[PDB]
Amino acid sequence: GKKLSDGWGYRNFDRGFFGNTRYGAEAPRVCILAMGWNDSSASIATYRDQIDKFVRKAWGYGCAVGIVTVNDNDSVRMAFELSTKKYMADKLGVEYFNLGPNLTSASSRNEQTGYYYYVKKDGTWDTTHPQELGQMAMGNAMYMQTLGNKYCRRVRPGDMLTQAAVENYWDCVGYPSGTHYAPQYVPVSGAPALNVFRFLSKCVTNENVTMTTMVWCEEEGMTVSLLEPWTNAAVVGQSHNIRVESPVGKALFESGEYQERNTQINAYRTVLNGKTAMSYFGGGKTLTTYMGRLRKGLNFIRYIIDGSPTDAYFPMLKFGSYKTDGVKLPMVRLSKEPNMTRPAPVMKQSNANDYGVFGEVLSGTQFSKTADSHLYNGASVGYLAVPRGLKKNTYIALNYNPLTNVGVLVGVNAAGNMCIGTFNNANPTDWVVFGDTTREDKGFKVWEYTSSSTGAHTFTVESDDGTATTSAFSTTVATSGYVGLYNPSASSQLFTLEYSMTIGNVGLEHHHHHH
Amino acid sequence: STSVYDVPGIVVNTTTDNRAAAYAFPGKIFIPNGVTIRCNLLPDDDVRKFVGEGKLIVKNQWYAKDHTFDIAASMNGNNKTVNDEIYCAFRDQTFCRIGIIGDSITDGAWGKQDWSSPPTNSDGDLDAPSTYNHSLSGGSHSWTEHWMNGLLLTQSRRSGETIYQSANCSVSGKKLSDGWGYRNFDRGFFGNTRYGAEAPRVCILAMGWNDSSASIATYRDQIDKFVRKAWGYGCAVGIVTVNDNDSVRMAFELSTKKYMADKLGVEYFNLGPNLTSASSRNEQTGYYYYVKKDGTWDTTHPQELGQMAMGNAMYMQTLGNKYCRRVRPGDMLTQAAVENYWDCVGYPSGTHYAPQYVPVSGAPALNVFRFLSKCVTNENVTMTTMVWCEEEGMTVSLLEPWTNAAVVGQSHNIRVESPVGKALFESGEYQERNTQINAYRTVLNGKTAMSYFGGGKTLTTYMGRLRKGLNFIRYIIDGSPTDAYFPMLKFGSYKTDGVKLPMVRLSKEPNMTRPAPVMKQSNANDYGVFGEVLSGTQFSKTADSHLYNGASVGYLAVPRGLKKNTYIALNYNPLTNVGVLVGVNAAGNMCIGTFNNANPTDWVVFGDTTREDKGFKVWEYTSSSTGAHTFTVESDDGTATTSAFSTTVATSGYVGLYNPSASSQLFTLEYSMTIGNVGLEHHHHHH
Ligand SMILES: [Cl-]
Ligand SMILES: [Cl-]
Ligand SMILES: [Cl-]
Ligand SMILES: [Cl-]
Ligand SMILES: [Cl-]
Ligand SMILES: [Cl-]
């Protein structure tokens, strides 16, 4: 209810800063003039003079002065603010800020956000005084226009946050010591993926850590994936997890009079949450976790490592879009050379484009790689179709990792049965054999699911004639990779197939009985 | 400088014309603060003769009138700003005459094929005295007037009053190096009573192209001279580069006009980039933008679409900056702060209505909105907005959030034009060319879903592709409505729009009484009204209708068929519990029907009684006549077919599964909705 035209802001500069010993009883190092909305009946000239008066008082007392417009939701106020606060900021040579645009973005995400941003507890409409999420979106804009400008990366689909200059973007606080650790760059080798990295960044903590970062999404519909580049001495079951909040701010108090409303809004802010792949598969690995959708504007990312680790490595983040993420291999028909001892990807890119660790995880192409796990597992569906079947001793490879030479095989063995197994840097020793011995050149489908309990990739194979089926194969070893072909037979053979990995969020069931 | 009191021949009063004495004196003249003299300056007289903080009384050479020249403003700048004046005029609702001094491009070539220059005398200068208005004549379709169009369309959201008007004093072949722009400042503005016979509130210097043989230093000095004259007479000065299509001119413009704009502290504008975008959209736009009526190539004087694209850039760099949203695929324009982006003019009253925010409920979609914006009109309305597309290949969808008391058949329609401007005159000598170019501008047009399905509903309409740059969106509501609600707009891409559900195999629980979507997102991501309409994913929703209906194809495949009393749901709306069912009934026949918040009472049953676990496809089409969604079902063995099902009730929703049987069952399916534009037929005979 206070106005700049009244002289209230000018007077209470003294009373507010000099008169408050908790505020230091002195001029503040930074002084922000944020008034404007109340005064629209006052002349442009009048208001300009009041701004001049205010700025020079603050200048004289040693303050670094800024001027900020906080809201853009009123047609006339926008023009007024431009002619006074923006005008005087330029003329006086003081920094100008507008939080309005980001409020508009956050509040206009869909058909429901208008409620969350502008509807008061008494059920009335107010775009002048935004609700909790609105106040956060404004603060987020102010952060981006200050420290965020150099310390927060602006991202679009296709971008990656790597292990380089992590100290710019990440912190690493230990629990319970509360130590803020400093990143180190160490050379890594002795495993194919590490030889790709050459160097990773880490902290030596010997305790649980919380690694946080922020990114600014330039577009709606964006997504994020997690790379845990070296799971060192981790043990399966530890509570490693990750969480994304957007918009960002001081969390509402989960207590008091408005505990329910506050819990509701915080939950709404939390757009992603769950266990990482490391929690499923343990140490000595390099693992990828699909997470899901982000929000336009500022996103807060909190990453927890459990089990009191000696070394804690910073993760990398890959950004995509929910409109294109997945794996999409349209129908292809191609021959492969005989006497192979190693599966080969159906569709390759240049090594400069993808060296097979993280860059093409669920990127949604004919070149894409699956992920080891999802934040929301047991909700996605891998699908392979081999319409004209396969020759004997000929197989399709699923989740094949050319770097580690590990993947799943499915096809027709020498005896003419269907079979599925784990190619673990050698021909499988865990073959699951099924159906009659006449499976050559007969079509089948393969469906892949994941367990939200174990992280295991479970496979169901069904011949088109309905005679040969199995779901008896499951793996926690060949959990991600590319589609490949394998021809260990003595003759060149044709392979016809398509593959698609569809991402889901709500868990789905896929069981039926023999009846 | 010399003090004015020491200069021979000067008389310090307000009546004696000190002009002859002042310019007979060879040096500069200092007039102190608070002191005014009469100096009847002639248009060629260098106003930099005077320094200090005094004032001149300057007689109008064409009307019985005087003008004040402020030397302090001329010497130090007046701190006025083009944007400041334009935004101030919007807020204060005061008149804002915008004057432009320029050359051929700004004159209006080739904004319309019958373009002509302002009248000029035998000396080559603007006629004065004058009642000429270029905007109503040969320069009616210059980029300046398209710029005005954008301003006036933004102004329309407050009032019907025409506060933005141009004074385009631009003549082809004229130069700044000659001193022509400096001289004709006076003649153009003072000498024209239709232009107010005074300095304009805004003054734009748009010259540049002609002068490339003149020195950088020479040209800088001419800009300095011009700006200070305009400063002294009270103008908010801007400098604009209009074209970027010449390699050498770009560098020249940077070293003079951009350079001096920064040094003098006046706003700088470049319309070039947007011209480049619009003109480089594809392999054919080069013709539309740069080929003259005589079949020759000219990238210096763009055609009609080029002039509009330039004006659009100028609008974006002025009022458009706060009053036009910049969009990319994924963005939505909602019901919040519509007054910033929309107007609402009634017909025939011509009233400009003000938006109201009212609480809504009593229907699932309204409970999602909680609040909508509307106008109470009791008459037909036209709602217009503009958006700026940051990318090529973008699309738009329409949401009509509450169709209130609408009746089926009313002519509600929507139209998109891009680039934007004053429409070419559909008459005269170039009626055919003009009609052609306007049609080309109009990138989308057609009936809305409300026109098909009527009142008491919430409806979505897919529209189609937009253009990079400024897009004009006009929305008409017919049938004299009491309430008119503002629509929301969702933006996508033509490369990804549709519905795409790859092959999925999943089981569902027995004894359901409600279909359930195959693939869900979080409620925060999509609450099922508008956010995922044709977004092109496994989560996406279909639309009730298209601007271009009867051109798209829904496709469902159920390769391994279905168990008895088990169905796939199409267009299922979980909010209203409404959708289409197709599958195998308890008797073992195929069937299709409308699940209207209950099991269907309109079942269409066909085929023999052995359809269990036998594959079928389903094809969905729309009528451009009725808006109805018509279905064709065909079993893979060819024995069971029907096209006898049609709905105007279950017109949009998600893919779902329905298992009312007593056992858990597997469902294998894929679905795709492909958007088309040219209408297609899909009928065959039993022969
Ligand atoms: Cl207030
Ligand atoms: Cl006020
Ligand atoms: Cl100056
Ligand atoms: Cl004459
Ligand atoms: Cl010219
Ligand atoms: Cl020249």
Concatenating the DSSP letter of every residue in A160-171 gives EE-STTHHHH--
Strand bridging mode B332-333 / B488-493? antiparallel
Question: Amino acid letter at B218?
Answer: T
Residue A184 CA from chain centroid, whole number: 24
Nearest to A415, CA basis, from A439, A451, A396: A439
Residues of B in contact with A460 (CB under 8 A): 505
* DSSP state letter for B129: S
Give the number of other Cβ atoms within 10 Å of residue A256's Cβ. 8
Q: Identify which of A326, A505, A510 has the shortest CB distance to residue B505.
A: A510
Nearest CA distance, B423 vs chain A (angstrom): 27
Residue B329 CA from chain centroid, whole number: 16
Question: Amino acid letter at B226?
Answer: F
Residues of A in contact with B266 (CB under 8 A): none
Q: Do B336 and A115 touch (CB under 8 A)?
A: no
Q: Mutation target for A interface from B400, B538, B573: give the one with most A CBs within 10 A.
A: B538
Question: Amino acid letter at B459?
Answer: L
Nearest CA distance, A266 vs chain B (angstrom): 12
What contacts B139, CB < 8 A, 6 or more positions away?
A: B107, B108, B111, B115, B116, B117, B118, B145, B168, B170
What are B569's strand-pairing partners? B581, B656
Question: Amino acid letter at B529?
Answer: V
Q: Report how far residue B384's alpha carbon sits from residue B157's, in angstroms, rounded to the nearest whole number.
A: 9
Q: Is B51 helix (H, G, I), strand (E, B) or coil?
A: strand
Q: Identify which of A107, A296, A500 has the shortest CB distance to residue B502.
A: A500
Q: Report how far residue B339's alpha carbon sits from residue B385's, in angstroms, rounded to the nearest whole number.
A: 10
Q: Is B313 helix (H, G, I), strand (E, B) or coil?
A: helix
Q: Identify which of A75, A114, A268 has the shortest CB distance to residue B334.
A: A114
Strand bridging mode B629-635 / B641-647? antiparallel
* DSSP state letter for B350: -
Structure tokens at B264: 């003098």
Residues of A in contact with B151 (CB under 8 A): none
Q: Is A51 helix (H, G, I), strand (E, B) or coil?
A: helix
Q: Please, are residues B668 and B505 in contact by the beta-carbon 8 Å criterion?
A: yes
Q: Report how far residue B419's alpha carbon sits from residue B309's, in angstroms, rounded to the nearest whole number.
A: 6
Query: Exposure pattern of A21-48 as b/e (b: 16+ CB <10 Å)?
Result: eeeeeebbeebbbbbbbebbebebeebb
Residues of A in contact with B401 (CB under 8 A): 111
What number of CA atoms fall less than 13 Å from residue A475's CA on the CB side? 25
Largest CA distance in chain A: 94
Q: Please, are residues A462 and A373 in contact by the beta-carbon 8 Å criterion?
A: no
Q: How far is the CA of B211 from the centre of ligand 6 (A)?
A: 3
Q: Report how far residue B252's alpha carbon sits from residue B266's, in angstroms, rounded to the nearest whole number.
A: 18
Q: Please, are residues B415 and B442 in contact by the beta-carbon 8 Å criterion?
A: yes
B400: left (phi over 0), alpha (psi -120 to 50) or beta: beta
Q: Is B554 helix (H, G, I), strand (E, B) or coil?
A: strand
Q: Do B337 and A104 touch (CB under 8 A)?
A: yes
Residues of A in contact with B336 (CB under 8 A): 73, 107-108, 114, 117-118, 127
Structure tokens at B408: 């089926």
Q: Do A221 and B329 touch (CB under 8 A)?
A: yes
Structure tokens at B655: 């893919």
Q: Please, are residues A283 and A233 in contact by the beta-carbon 8 Å criterion?
A: yes
Q: Identify which of B336, B340, B538 has the shortest CB distance to residue A502.
A: B538
Residues of B in contact with A323 (CB under 8 A): 329, 496, 535-537
For residue B496, the chain A residue with the least C-alpha distance is A323
Strand bridging mode A64-69 / A30-33? parallel
Please return the burial class of B666, using the count of CB atoms within 10 Å of its CB with bins 0-12, 13-18 and 19+. middle
Residues of A in contact with B338 (CB under 8 A): none
Which secondary-structure segment (H or E) carries B314?
helix B304-316
Q: Report how far residue B500's alpha carbon sits from residue B485's, in angstroms, rounded to the nearest whole number.
A: 31
Three state DSSP letters for B460-520: EEEEEECCCEEEEEEEEECCCCCEEECCEEEEEECCCCEEEEEEEEEEECCCCCCCEECCC
Q: Is residue B129 reached through a cis peptide bond, with omega within 30 degrees of 0 on the bond before it?
A: yes
Q: Report how far residue B359's alpha carbon sits from residue B485's, in angstroms, rounded to the nearest whole number.
A: 12
* DSSP state letter for A58: H
What contacts B178, CB < 8 A, 6 or more positions away?
A: none
Q: Identify which of A83, A111, A505 has the shortest CB distance to residue B522.
A: A505
Q: Do A108 and B333 touch (CB under 8 A)?
A: yes
Q: Please, are residues A440 and A416 in contact by the beta-carbon 8 Å criterion?
A: yes
Q: Is residue B118 reached through a cis peptide bond, with omega within 30 degrees of 0 on the bond before it?
A: no
Query: Which residue reads 């000929």 in tokens?
Result: A394
Q: How far is the CA of B243 from the centre of ligand 5 (A)?
A: 12
Strands of A218-341, DSSP E: 222-228, 241-245, 270-275, 287-293, 297-305, 311-313, 316-321, 327-336
Q: Which ligand is nearest to the CA of B298?
A: 5
Q: Do B330 and A381 touch (CB under 8 A)?
A: no
Give the number of other Cβ atoms within 10 Å of residue B587's Cβ. 11
Q: Identify which of A80, A107, A512 has the shortest CB distance to residue B336.
A: A107
Q: Report how far residue A131's alpha carbon sits from residue A241's, in angstroms, rounded to the nearest whole number.
A: 29
Nearest to B228, CA basis, from B30, B390, B85, B51: B51
For residue B400, the chain A residue with the least C-alpha distance is A111
Q: Report how far residue B179's alpha carbon sits from residue B468's, in angstroms, rounded to the nearest whole number.
A: 38
Strand bridging mode B325-327 / B380-389? parallel
Q: Please, are residues B105 and B117 in contact by the beta-carbon 8 Å criterion?
A: no
Q: Is residue A176 reached through a cis peptide bond, with omega within 30 degrees of 0 on the bond before it?
A: yes
Q: Is B154 helix (H, G, I), strand (E, B) or coil?
A: helix
Question: Amino acid letter at B344?
Answer: C
Which secondary-structure segment (H or E) carries B183?
helix B180-185
Q: Report how far residue B163's alpha carbon sits from residue B154's, in angstroms, rounded to the nearest whole number.
A: 11
Nearest to B217, CA basis, from B274, B275, B177: B177
Q: Please, are residues B658 and B566 in contact by the beta-carbon 8 Å criterion?
A: yes
Question: Amino acid letter at A57?
Answer: K
Which secondary-structure segment (H or E) carries B635?
strand B629-635
Q: Report how far residue B652's alpha carbon sits from residue B369's, in angstroms, rounded to the nearest whole number.
A: 18
Q: Please, are residues B659 and A512 in contact by the beta-carbon 8 Å criterion?
A: no
Nearest CA distance, A93 vs chain B (angstrom): 13
Nearest to A33, CA basis, from A59, A3, A67, A1: A67
Give the number of other Cβ atoms within 10 Å of residue A334's Cβ. 11
How many CB pairs lie under 8 A apart between chains A and B? 163
Q: Report how far residue A220's alpha carbon sits from residue A107's, in angstroms, rounded to the nearest whole number.
A: 12
What number of CA atoms fall less than 13 Å from residue B292's CA on the CB side? 11
Three state DSSP letters for A356-370: CCCCCECECCCCCEC
Q: Please, are residues A67 and A85 in contact by the beta-carbon 8 Å criterion?
A: yes
Q: Report how far residue B131's alpha carbon sits from residue B129's, in angstroms, rounded to the nearest whole number.
A: 7
Could you give the angle at which helices B143-155 and B82-92 cross, rounded to 10 degrees?
A: 40
Q: Report how far residue A140's alpha carbon sits from residue A298's, in angstroms, rounded to the nearest whole number.
A: 6
State the structure-solving technique.
X-ray
Q: Which ligand is nearest to the CA of A1?
A: 1
Query: Exposure pattern of B275-298 as b/e (b: 16+ CB <10 Å)?
Result: bebbbeeeeebeebbbeeeeeeeb
What are A373's strand-pairing partners? A289
Q: Do B330 and A125 touch (CB under 8 A)?
A: no
